[PDB]
Structure 1
Amino acid sequence: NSNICEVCNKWGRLFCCDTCPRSFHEHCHIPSVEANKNPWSCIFCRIKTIQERCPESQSGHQESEVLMRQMLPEEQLKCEFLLLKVYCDSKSCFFASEPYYNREGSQGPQKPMWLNKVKTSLNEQMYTRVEGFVQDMRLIFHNHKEFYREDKFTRLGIQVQDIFEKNFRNIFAIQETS
């Protein structure tokens, strides 16, 4: 197995996947690494198994159909993985914890949002459809762009939104377009 966490790239107390060489800190994995379960298979493996069991799941999909899907076990796992892929980027630090807003010339967002809040929401099964999760995710980046206006720091939101959207298209097999 790898000797660094797949998500944050640090060593530490790592749990090793039994079916692939990746390793994780307890709370870097999503869901948080399970207490028992021998063998244990990580989310990368669990997602690959879904694909292998239903190869047609990789045919193209319309976003609008994906969003209205109910959060059954497989869609729950897919959103957990997508969330994880965002945390995998070091720029996710800016969006992880609860933000605050005190900048001359700007007003904070009406509905603040952050990665850890989405993580908790998933963990507590608060989303009934994929739409709920995707909306909160895009809201993080939208809030950021609006608040930071012409400061160059707005670019961090563009950058992390691009990682989210690329991973969304891949995980949910959204039909490729020009």
Structure 2
Amino acid sequence: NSNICEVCNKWGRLFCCDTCPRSFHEHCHIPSVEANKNPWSCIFCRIKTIQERCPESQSGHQESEVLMRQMLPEEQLKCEFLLLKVYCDSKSCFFASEPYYNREGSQGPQKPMWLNKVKTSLNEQMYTRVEGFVQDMRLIFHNHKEFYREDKFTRLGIQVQDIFEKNFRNIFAIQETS
């Protein structure tokens, strides 16, 4: 197994996947690494199994159809994995914890949102459709763009949104377009 966490790239108290060489901090994995379970398979491995069981699941889909899907166990898992792929980028730090807004010439968003809030919402099964999770994720970056205006810091929102959107298209097998 790797000697650094797959998500934050640090050493520490690491749990090792039994079916792949990745390792995780307990609360870096999503869901948090399960108490017992021998063997244990990481989210990467669990997603790869879904694909392998249903190869046709990789054919292209329309985003509108994916969004309306109910959050059954496979869709729950896919959203957890997509959230984890965002935390994998170091720039996610800016969006992880609860923000506050006090900048001359700007007003804070009406509905603040942040990664750890989405993480709790998934854990608590608060989303009934994929659409709920995707709307909160996109809200994080939209709030950031609106608040930071012409400050160059706006670009951090564009960057992490791009990581979200690429991973969304991969994980949910969105039909490729020009």
Normalised by the length of structure 1, the TM-score is 1.00
Q: CA deviation at 1:123?
A: 0.1
SS of the residue 1:127 aligns to: coil
Q: Where does residue 64 of structure 2 map in the other structure?
A: 64
Inter-partner Cα distance in structure 2 for 1:60 and 1:3:
36
Aligned-residue CA RMSD (Å) = 0.1
Q: CA deviation at 1:37?
A: 0.2
Q: CA deviation at 1:166?
A: 0.1
List per-residue Cα deviations over 1:93-143 (Å, max 9, x = no partner): 000000000000000000000000000000000000000000000000000
Structure 2 residues without counterparts, runs of 5 or longer:
none
Inter-partner Cα distance in structure 2 for 1:23 and 1:166:
23
Inter-partner Cα distance in structure 2 for 1:103 and 1:169:
34
Inter-partner Cα distance in structure 1 for 2:166 and 2:104:
34
Query: Which consecutive aligned stretches of 4+ in structure 1 deviate over 3 angstroms post-superposition?
Result: none
List per-residue Cα deviations over 1:58-95 (Å, max 9, x = no partner): 00000000000000000000000000000000000000
Q: Where does residue 33 of structure 1 map in the other structure?
A: 33
Q: CA deviation at 1:42?
A: 0.1
Q: CA deviation at 1:2?
A: 0.1
List per-residue Cα deviations over 1:122-177 (Å, max 9, x = no partner): 00000000000000000000000000000000000000000000000000000000
Structure 1 residues without counterparts, runs of 5 or longer:
none
Q: Where does residue 73 of structure 1 map in the other structure?
A: 73
Inter-partner Cα distance in structure 2 for 1:53 and 1:34:
23
Inter-partner Cα distance in structure 1 for 2:123 and 2:150:
35
How many pairs align? 178
Inter-partner Cα distance in structure 1 for 2:117 and 2:166:
22
Identity %: 100
SS of the residue 1:15 aligns to: strand
Q: CA deviation at 1:46?
A: 0.0
SS of the residue 1:31 aligns to: coil
Inter-partner Cα distance in structure 1 for 2:56 and 2:26:
33
SS of the residue 2:175 aligns to: coil
SS of the residue 1:24 aligns to: strand
SS of the residue 1:38 aligns to: coil
Q: Where does residue 125 of structure 1 map in the other structure?
A: 125
SS of the residue 2:12 aligns to: coil
Q: Where does residue 90 of structure 2 map in the other structure?
A: 90
